[PDB]
Amino acid sequence: GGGGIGVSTGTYDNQTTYKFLGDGWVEITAHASRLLHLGMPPSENYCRVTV
Amino acid sequence: GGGGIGVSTGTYDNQTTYKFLGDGWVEITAHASRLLHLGMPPSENYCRVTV
Numbered sequence: 001g002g003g004g005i006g007v008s009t010g011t012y013d014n015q016t017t018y019k020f021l022g023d024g025w026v027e028i029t030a031h032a033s034r035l036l037h038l039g040m041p042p043s044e045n046y047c048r049v050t051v
Numbered sequence: 052g053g054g055g056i057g058v059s060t061g062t063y064d065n066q067t068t069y070k071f072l073g074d075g076w077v078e079i080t081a082h083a084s085r086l087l088h089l090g091m092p093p094s095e096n097y098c099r100v101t102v
Contacts, residue, residue, distance in 0.1 A: 020075045
């Protein structure tokens with residue numbers, strides 16, 4: 001159904017919309033979309049490191 | 052009644068009001084008030100002057 005490997009699961013949107021309401025009030029909706037690169041953690045163990 | 056020699060007959064107003072309506076529309080009402088000095092016309096006759 002909605003879930004599928006070949007179907008996209010979201011929409012890229014990065015635009016700042018300005019909605020002027022009244023009496024000088026402004027609704028500023030800021031959309032931000034970015035592509036993220038994640039890699040394998042050097043270790044899978046939590047570590048107490050001392051500097 | 053409303054008319055009187057000692058009563059003022061108007062209000063001095065010289066302010067630019069900004070009324071934001073919506074969708075970014077602005078109603079700019081500009082009030083302007085000035086004191087005017089008028090003197091007697093050098094002549095009371097219409098004149099066809101040639102330069």
